[PDB]
């Protein structure tokens, strides 16, 4: 699988040795090239995963993530074109290195064949993002933003490490294939429930879980524009991809003690969606809506119904995209006005009509309107939950109450309505914003026509 790994490793000499003017022209022109190279990984067998080597392998679950990450990397490049034009060239090369290194650690992480190799490359991603969030951030609190990020993720990461080595000494291998074939029932002993607690709370923290979610509002809001998309789009989803992987040996204790988490997600998803409708900062909305959708997929894995694993993958990519346009859009209002208050800028179609067109179709994508894979994945979660419990619908049905209650709400107060006559700052839309808008939303309608590949391994 070094088809994709090495050219990204080499991309660091590429950007570092590139000339003064190109750099970003260089950075994109080859990151797109790597994207179609990673588009090859769409070749799955039925159920036997693509085992490329002893340490690297991929399956129907990992591959959609790989294409998401690799194709994402050009997007923050062009997204960061505006924000970081003033800075000198050397840090420009360093910033791209952080982006490439981040995507580098992502692709190996999703493709590791040994659990600890996944873990070492799991939390290896906070190191570059901590640099991105803290150094290149904009507002003052960004200092405390990074601390909240790493400490939250680490507070659960270390228990996983102690658990992982324990399984190594107990079973003899943490490799996905061996642990899957030699999967054994995790008994109900108090020792084993804490083992389950160790192997789950790590992903739950950066899931996030209701109550264990403060980092995203304190990080995504003050993260740099490029950094903000990457966190929500994919760096949310390491825990998820790990979660469906480690859940092969935690049975049957999962069906017995997932209730507190199924609780905290269900109430949290309504709670997060409701508070999402009542923030004064637009950037907090995509952050709070993100966890609301993200709280949904934790429900999927807990019931571990085949249908639940169906929508877990689809919603992951769907939301992972969905947060991307909104953060891109929410960015576009910011630097134009140097504020993230939706109240300050209202009715932008009277000034930016094309931006509004992109705004609404991303919004209705967040609405989970079929045939978009946002709904079908999200819908499969509903069906699995009903199989788990018929009553489940009402609490989550309350989530199909708040989403559109806010997901069109900023539309009618950011892109829709009248304009304040004092902001002459608002200007025409540079084609970059619409162009990246095109590569952002056009895919989601494209693979909508063909949902089986991003459906997941349960096909």
């Amino acid at each position: 699988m070094l088809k994709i790994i090495i050219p990204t490793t080499m991309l660091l000499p590429m950007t570092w040795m590139s000339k003064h003017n190109m750099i970003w022209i260089n950075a994109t022109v080859h990151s797109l090239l790597i994207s179609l190279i990673s588009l090859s990984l769409l070749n799955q067998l039925g159920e036997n995963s693509l085992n490329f080597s002893l340490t690297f392998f991929s399956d129907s679950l990992s591959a959609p993530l790989l294409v998401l990450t690799t194709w994402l990397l050009p997007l923050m490049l062009m997204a960061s074109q505006s924000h970081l034009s003033k800075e000198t060239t050397t840090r420009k090369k360093l910033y791209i290195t952080m982006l490439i290194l981040l995507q580098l650690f992502l692709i190996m992480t999703f493709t590791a064949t040994e659990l600890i190799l996944f873990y070492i490359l799991f939390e290896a991603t906070l190191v570059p993002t901590l640099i991105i969030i803290t150094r290149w951030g904009n507002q003052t609190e960004r200092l405390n933003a990074g601390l909240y990020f790493l400490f939250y993720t680490l507070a659960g990461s270390l228990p996983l490490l102690v658990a992982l080595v324990y399984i190594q000494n107990t079973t003899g291998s943490l490799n996905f294939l061996i642990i899957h074939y030699w999967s054994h029932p995790l008994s109900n002993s108090w020792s084993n429930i804490f083992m389950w607690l160790a192997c789950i709370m790590a992903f739950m923290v950066k899931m996030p879980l209701y109550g264990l979610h403060l980092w995203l509002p304190k990080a995504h809001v003050e993260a740099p524009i490029a950094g903000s998309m990457v966190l929500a789009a994919v760096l949310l989803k390491l825990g998820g991809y790990g979660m469906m992987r480690i859940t092969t040996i935690l049975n049957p204790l999962t069906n017995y003690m997932a209730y507190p988490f199924l609780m905290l997600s269900m109430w949290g998803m309504i709670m997060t969606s409701s508070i999402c409708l009542r923030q004064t900062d637009l950037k907090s909305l995509i952050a709070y809506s993100s966890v609301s959708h993200m709280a949904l997929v934790i429900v999927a894995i807990m019931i571990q119904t085949p249908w639940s694993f169906m929508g877990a993958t689809a919603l992951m990519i769907a939301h992972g995209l969905t947060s991307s346009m909104l953060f891109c859009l929410a960015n576009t209002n910011y630097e134009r006005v140097h504020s993230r208050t939706m109240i300050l800028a209202r009715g932008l179609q009277t000034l930016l009509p094309l931006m509004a067109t992109w705004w609404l179709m991303a919004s209705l994508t967040n609405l989970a309107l079929p045939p978009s894979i946002n709904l079908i994945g999200e819908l499969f979660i509903i069906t699995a939950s009903f199989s788990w419990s018929n009553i489940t619908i009402i609490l989550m049905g309350m989530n199909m109450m708040i989403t559109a209650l806010y997901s069109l709400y900023m539309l009618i107060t950011t892109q829709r309505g009248k304009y304040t006559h004092h902001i002459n700052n608002i200007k025409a839309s540079f084609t970059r914003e619409n162009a990246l808008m095109a590569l952002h939303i056009l895919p989601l309608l494209l693979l909508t026509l063909n949902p089986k590949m991003i459906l997941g391994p349960l096909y």
Binding site: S53, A112, E114
Partner: protein, 57 residues
């Protein structure tokens, strides 16, 4: 009929032809512990290399 021993002459170490049997176990030593299992064979490459975590070699 005696001779005065010369200086150093009397201090010479001497041999005695006693007929007493040799003390087989003068210290009354018991059986001693057997040695550890010795090392033998030839050094062959370690199976699957280091075998530590994910390191294939």
């Amino acid at each position: 009929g005696w001779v005065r021993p010369d200086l150093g002459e009397l201090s010479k170490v001497t041999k005695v032809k006693t007929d007493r049997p040799l003390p087989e176990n003068p210290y009354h030593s018991r059986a001693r512990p057997e040695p550890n299992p010795e090392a033998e064979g030839d050094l062959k490459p370690a199976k699957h290399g280091s075998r530590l975590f994910f390191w294939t070699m």
